[PDB]
Amino acid sequence: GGKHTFNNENVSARLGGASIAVQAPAQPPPYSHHHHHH
Amino acid sequence: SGAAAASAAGYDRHITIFSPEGRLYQVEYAFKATNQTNINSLAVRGKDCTVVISQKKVPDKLLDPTTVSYIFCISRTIGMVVNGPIPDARNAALRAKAEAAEFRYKYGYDMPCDVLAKRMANLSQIYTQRAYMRPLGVILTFVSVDEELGPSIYKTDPAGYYVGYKATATGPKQQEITTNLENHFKKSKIDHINEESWEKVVEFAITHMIDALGTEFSKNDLEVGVATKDKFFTLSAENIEERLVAI
């Protein structure tokens, strides 16, 4: 009744994103006004 | 890793903060200022006569070169040459010239370069304790012909370190020079140098900061000092014309 094949391949890309990280050192100011400047 | 945790976690904008390495960094960043002119002095001893030399650059023609100078006659028997920007050289020059004086008003004689390098350096420490003042971005040399010690060179840096060398140079180009007289001294084993005349000792020190410096010099690109008993002063231009004729 049917002679064709299908050949289900992985022609599609894909991805899994949980790029979870730790540090975040971005920007500590301990001199918000330099604390008497002097 | 060296200054990575420095440049990020403070430690580079307050003076009075140590790093866990022990290093404070602000004063260790002052020295980069000393070389902001690309200038390179020198100093040497004598039998009784001392000398110090400096370049004096050739900028745009509009200057009046009589006044461009990094040689400041402080008092008599004393003098100094700086390594760093001009304005941060004056405030050291003037805080001194009004300091040799009061001594002579308060103790009855003129200071040597010993004390004058211990006093002014006993101050640049203080300004690295308190936040009174950013430490002056210089490193300065002194000279004298003392009565009790003979010739004498001294040196001072923004922390407060001071030692009386036998001969030295400074600037961006110390290694080239310093070797071209370190090797000279191990020849003869004389802390001082011969050639009694303050004249003949100049031409020694010129030519060593020619061969090891990297080019040839005219009369205008230089300015030179000298110290002799009772005096300190500056000089004329013929001393090289009476060199190359002999060679």
Side-chain angles (χ1 to χ4, degrees), chain A residues 1-3 10-26 28-30 33-38, chain B residues 2-31 33-121 123-247:
Chain A
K3 294 180 185 172
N10 63 358
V11 301
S12 184
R14 66 192 294 277
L15 72 178
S19 295
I20 199 167
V22 179
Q23 290 75 236
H33 50 276
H34 291 82
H35 301 289
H36 198 188
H37 283 289
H38 193 274
Chain B
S7 186
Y11 301 165
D12 292 330
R13 62 198 73 195
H14 291 95
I15 305 168
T16 73
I17 301 300
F18 289 94
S19 62
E21 297 180 355
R23 292 197 289 135
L24 50 84
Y25 290 142
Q26 211 81 46
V27 312
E28 179 175 354
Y29 288 181
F31 299 182
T34 61
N35 293 322
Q36 290 289 317
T37 61
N38 283 318
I39 296 297
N40 42 15
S41 74
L42 183 141
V44 292
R45 290 176 76 192
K47 291 184 183 174
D48 58 350
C49 294
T50 302
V51 72
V52 298
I53 292 94
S54 177
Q55 297 180 359
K56 184 168 79 76
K57 302 291 281 182
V58 290
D60 56 354
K61 295 186 283 293
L62 280 77
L63 273 71
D64 195 1
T66 63
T67 189
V68 58
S69 295
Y70 294 175
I71 305 300
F72 298 158
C73 55
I74 290 290
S75 72
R76 298 176 65 258
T77 71
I78 306 290
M80 62 95 76
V81 60
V82 299
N83 302 115
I86 183 171
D88 289 330
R90 272 75 169 281
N91 196 1
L94 189 143
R95 182 64 176 84
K97 292 162 80 167
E99 202 171 17
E102 69 180 0
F103 189 91
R104 178 62 178 81
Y105 177 76
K106 189 168 71 61
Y107 282 137
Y109 59 96
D110 295 332
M111 287 203 295
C113 61
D114 290 327
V115 174
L116 188 76
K118 179 166 182 175
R119 183 68 178 78
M120 184 176 282
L123 291 173
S124 301
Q125 184 270 332
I126 286 163
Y127 296 109
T128 62
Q129 289 286 109
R130 277 82 183 182
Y132 288 122
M133 180 176 75
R134 66 176 171 79
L136 287 168
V138 311
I139 183 170
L140 45 85
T141 305
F142 291 109
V143 305
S144 64
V145 184
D146 288 331
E147 64 187 356
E148 182 168 358
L149 277 293
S152 61
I153 303 295
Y154 280 98
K155 176 69 76 69
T156 298
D157 60 354
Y161 191 70
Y162 79 98
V163 283
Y165 294 101
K166 296 188 286 182
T168 187
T170 187
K173 194 169 279 295
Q174 308 182 356
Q175 295 293 110
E176 289 77 2
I177 291 168
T178 305
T179 55
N180 204 159
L181 51 81
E182 191 274 328
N183 61 7
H184 175 274
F185 285 164
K186 61 172 69 178
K187 181 178 263 73
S188 298
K189 281 73 61 173
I190 40 173
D191 56 354
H192 67 82
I193 191 172
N194 297 310
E195 301 290 327
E196 177 70 28
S197 178
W198 58 270
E199 181 62 29
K200 297 286 178 285
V201 68
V202 166
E203 290 91 6
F204 180 85
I206 288 167
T207 185
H208 280 296
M209 72 185 290
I210 287 164
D211 63 350
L213 179 143
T215 191
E216 186 272 332
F217 290 166
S218 300
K219 70 196 178 67
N220 197 357
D221 56 353
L222 275 74
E223 61 180 2
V224 54
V226 66
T228 59
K229 289 174 92 294
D230 298 333
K231 289 180 75 65
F232 185 86
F233 60 106
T234 66
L235 298 182
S236 300
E238 67 91 21
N239 302 116
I240 194 68
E241 287 79 358
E242 68 186 1
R243 184 67 275 164
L244 73 163
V245 297
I247 296 89

